[PDB]
Amino acid sequence: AGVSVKDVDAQKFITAYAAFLKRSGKMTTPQWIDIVKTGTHKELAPYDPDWYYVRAAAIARHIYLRKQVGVGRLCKVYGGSVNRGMRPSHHRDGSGSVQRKVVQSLEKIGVLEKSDNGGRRISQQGQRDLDRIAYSLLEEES
Amino acid sequence: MATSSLTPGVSLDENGSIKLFNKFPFEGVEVKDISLVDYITIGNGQPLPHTAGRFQTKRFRKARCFIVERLTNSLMMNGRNNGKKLLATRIVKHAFEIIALLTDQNPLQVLVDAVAACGPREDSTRIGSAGTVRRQAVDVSPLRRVNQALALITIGAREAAFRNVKSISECLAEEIINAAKGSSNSYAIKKKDELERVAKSNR
Amino acid sequence: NTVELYAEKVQNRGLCAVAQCESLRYKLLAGLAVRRAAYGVLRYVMEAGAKGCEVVISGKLRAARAKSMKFADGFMIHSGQPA
């Protein structure tokens, strides 16, 4: 009727849907999901233990909203100010080693597909999954 | 009515021919002041104070400006916090909420009374020319009352919230509440009392 | 034979400052009086149709103490696009 992922919060979807992704058994979190900082501009380590799940299922929303993205583009997106000590800060790219694995896990799930003349796109399966969950959160109230 | 978009039934008019604050601090009523009805501008509502109007290209466009807007402007100080109006209005919105919870009055009339009472009345200005250090007592214009009061509250809140668990919004709310009913305990009122006393002594 | 040259004779010669500067330089190299040479060129350009001319000779004219002599005469613009 009037429902789309264009007006829905998808961050809260991941926390509830982590169980469903485990039921599907296609996330395949790598062994280094506890040591890596997900970017050099980061300082200590990720805090939330579901960081890989949240990043994956939110990059899916990012790819939905976008036309087509690549690994390097996603690294630039997931950056920030880097504390360079006494020198003034600047912008540094993210961690390609975790961006590529996150996208590849999404492709194995099925929400993503490789687009022609582009890095990656979002499948109809991912489009329908995102729309259905967006409808659930938009319609559950009252 | 209802359309395809949800449009939640919370942001209705709920005004009575006004615009109101962000659906809680309220506006309209009478407000009013004793001697700043010409220098304090409380007319139509301002749902959020983050307005980008031009109020400095002329001399008295600052006078024809909202008191809360000038409070945000005088709060966006301490240059490490310069140019953050979103942070300033978030602090002000928080300060309005705690004021409304702490005191029965809505957080507009109390602020008007606070700045009205906080503004200095007699000031010992320097004569000048150096060496003489004589100084003389003079009066204060209503525009100077607004800016002096707003500055006094902002520095008072900032200094008293610089290092303590109490947040800036709570400190500003407490300062405004104390400065409203002449408590002689707030930093702004204490400074204005000292300024009036020294002006009287130097007179 | 990919490049060829055509030698045009002249399109006026009393208003092009480079030609007059060369003539003044050659006269100074010959050894005529600086004022007389600066005059001669200024009369030449004025007859050629100049509205206002300025000749400035700077350096060691007669002694070690170098100086600059200016013989500006006429209408001169020190401004933007007009200048």
């Binding site: 264009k6 | 395809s4 615009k19 962000n22 983050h50 979103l86 | -």
Partner: protein, 140 residues
């Protein structure tokens, strides 16, 4: 076919409103007015709707295509587009009297709802890091 296009801007930003026949549909870039990025500035973009009234704002479909500037510029541009879409729609397909009825209120209370702000960034001069402020000198 009731279709009309409008434009609005706040300097470096711009916004296009594709007003069309319908009801509601005040979405911006595919998302409604309730989900602008700055949560603390949503009432500013909702201001043109409530200045006139939801009763007189019905009967239009406004789609915005903002681009450029910052977040404050984006919300200013979309509110400008949503404020001029209704005026042009009610000028082209409704009586000019009602258009003026909307306009008088929309000008009586507005933060330059249809007047572009002419303020611009001053160019920077050599000798300092800002347009007007120059670096300090030792003097000794």
């Amino acid at each position: 076919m009731q279709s009309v296009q409008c434009f609005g801007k706040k300097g470096n930003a711009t916004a296009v409103a594709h007003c069309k026949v319908g009801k509601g549909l005040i979405k911006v870039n595919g998302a409604p007015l309730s989900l602008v990025q700055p949560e603390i500035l949503r009432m500013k973009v909702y201001e043109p709707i409530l200045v006139a009234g939801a009763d007189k704002f019905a009967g239009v479909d406004i789609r915005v295509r903002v681009s450029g500037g910052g977040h404050v510029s984006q919300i200013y541009a979309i509110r400008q587009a949503i404020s001029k879409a209704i005026v042009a729609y009610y000028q082209k397909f409704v009586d000019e009297h009602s258009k003026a009825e909307l306009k008088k209120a929309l000008i009586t209370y507005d933060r330059t709802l249809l007047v572009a702000d002419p303020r611009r960034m001053e160019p920077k001069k050599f000798g300092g890091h800002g347009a007007r402020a120059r670096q300090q000198k030792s003097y000794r």
